[PDB]
Design a protein around this ligand. Sequence first.
Ligand SMILES: *C(=O)C[C@@H]1O[C@@H](C)[C@@H](O)[C@@H](O)[C@@H]1O
Ligand SMILES: *C(=O)C[C@@H]1O[C@@H](C)[C@@H](O)[C@@H](O)[C@@H]1O
Ligand SMILES: *C(=O)C[C@@H]1O[C@@H](C)[C@@H](O)[C@@H](O)[C@@H]1O
Ligand SMILES: *C(=O)C[C@@H]1O[C@@H](C)[C@@H](O)[C@@H](O)[C@@H]1O
Ligand SMILES: [Ca+2]
Ligand SMILES: [Ca+2]
Ligand SMILES: [Ca+2]
Ligand SMILES: [Ca+2]
Ligand SMILES: [Ca+2]
Ligand SMILES: [Ca+2]
Ligand SMILES: [Ca+2]
Ligand SMILES: [Ca+2]
Lengths: 8, 114, 114, 114, 114
Amino acid sequence: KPXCXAXK
Amino acid sequence: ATQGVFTLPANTRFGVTAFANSSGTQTVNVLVNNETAATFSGQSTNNAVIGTQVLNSGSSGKVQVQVSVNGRPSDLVSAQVILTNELNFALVGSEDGTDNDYNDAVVVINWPLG
Amino acid sequence: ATQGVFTLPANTRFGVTAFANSSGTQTVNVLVNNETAATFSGQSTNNAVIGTQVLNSGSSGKVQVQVSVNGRPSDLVSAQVILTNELNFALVGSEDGTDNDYNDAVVVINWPLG
Amino acid sequence: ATQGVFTLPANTRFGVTAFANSSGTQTVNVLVNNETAATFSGQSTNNAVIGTQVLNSGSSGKVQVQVSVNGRPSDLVSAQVILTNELNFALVGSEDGTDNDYNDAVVVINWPLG
Amino acid sequence: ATQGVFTLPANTRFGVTAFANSSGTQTVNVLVNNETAATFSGQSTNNAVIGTQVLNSGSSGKVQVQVSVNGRPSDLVSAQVILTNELNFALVGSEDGTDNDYNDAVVVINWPLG
Ligand SMILES: *C(=O)C[C@@H]1O[C@@H](C)[C@@H](O)[C@@H](O)[C@@H]1O
Ligand SMILES: *C(=O)C[C@@H]1O[C@@H](C)[C@@H](O)[C@@H](O)[C@@H]1O
Ligand SMILES: *C(=O)C[C@@H]1O[C@@H](C)[C@@H](O)[C@@H](O)[C@@H]1O
Ligand SMILES: *C(=O)C[C@@H]1O[C@@H](C)[C@@H](O)[C@@H](O)[C@@H]1O
Ligand SMILES: [Ca+2]
Ligand SMILES: [Ca+2]
Ligand SMILES: [Ca+2]
Ligand SMILES: [Ca+2]
Ligand SMILES: [Ca+2]
Ligand SMILES: [Ca+2]
Ligand SMILES: [Ca+2]
Ligand SMILES: [Ca+2]
């Protein structure tokens, strides 16, 4: 987060 | 009120198709006679068809759509519409968050087939 | 009455998905502002998806669905349903023959996306 | 496609209500299993409830709505919608002229009652 | 999801009509931009019309239906349907009890008028 798809 | 439950005519083939519009991965389960008959999962913000299948309503006709995101049930909205007294659509929207667009998984059931 | 014509909000993406349930090869044309925006052709008696696409309602918002089989226009039925004042479905059935199942091509338009 | 014909569950009470929005005097006939069950008439450009009645769908459940103006059948549009898998509305609009507002007589059928 | 809330075209006349199917006296409030614009009250187990009126959606277009029985709000189910891209119905059912028939007050909003 960000740049690797991390989140929801 | 209960949403996402529909009574179909018995022993009738129907189509079920799910679309995704969310950052969260959608899981759609389709239950016929209280048994899971189809499951689709996927993530899209562009209305991908995360699954489509043909099922049989069986002796009960009871069809239920459930939507969850990583195990958390989404809030559902639903209705059934009949055109020219023959062509049936059962429609489901779902909300996995707070913006209330209700499109995060969209499920359409249609019958008759063939 | 005219069928298969829907006024969408302008400049809004929408999904269009077509299913086939007939012996005949179905051709589904989707017009936006009176110009062809998508065409799908295929044949199935098992509700196969013959096309699915994301389109834009454009500056006009006018969307029209036409269906033909072997060059002959099918008779259409349609309606729009809105759930929780937000989630829109524009629904089309079509008949290419005499049995009046109106499922020969079924077209589902949904918005909003995202 | 045929419009204004609905299959209700057999032997079920239902409401039928008609509204007028036209300079032309509307006449609405409701047929249950092909027998005339109700006739309403009036003339309003402000949505007057020209008739409301409780009927029973009878042995076959077939309900048909017809609309005419001074003997001229109007063009009909219709659909049925079901909320929470239980609350039913059968909806009719009609057009007696050229403006295609389809509100000249509007008929709503609702069930269950009680 | 929120139910009984509808966004109408701004500054547009609409009809609203309520029917009762319950032992409890129904109070139907129709709000325009959160201000009570009409109130109907009555009791029937036979689908009697308890009120009908012509209103205007006003500058905001926001219309809401609320139903209560002796100060207790009822749960609502609702949807909007559009026929021939012109004729609009906003439909509400409500439940004051435990049987989940959702007909205890039924409210029909229709537009355009005239
Ligand atoms: C998570 O961020 C919310 C989620 O995904 C968004 C892109 C949007 O589709 C929203 O409606 C959905 O609930
Ligand atoms: C027959 O060819 C007519 C045609 O194909 C059938 C298999 C059935 O789908 C029917 O509805 C369709 O009009
Ligand atoms: C004239 O008779 C046409 C007729 O009455 C108008 C006032 C308007 O309601 C129109 O829709 C209707 O067809
Ligand atoms: C109270 O008795 C319940 C109430 O009135 C009944 C006659 C029936 O219409 C029921 O649906 C409603 O909730
Ligand atoms: Ca959402
Ligand atoms: Ca979304
Ligand atoms: Ca056919
Ligand atoms: Ca067919
Ligand atoms: Ca007219
Ligand atoms: Ca009119
Ligand atoms: Ca009740
Ligand atoms: Ca009741």
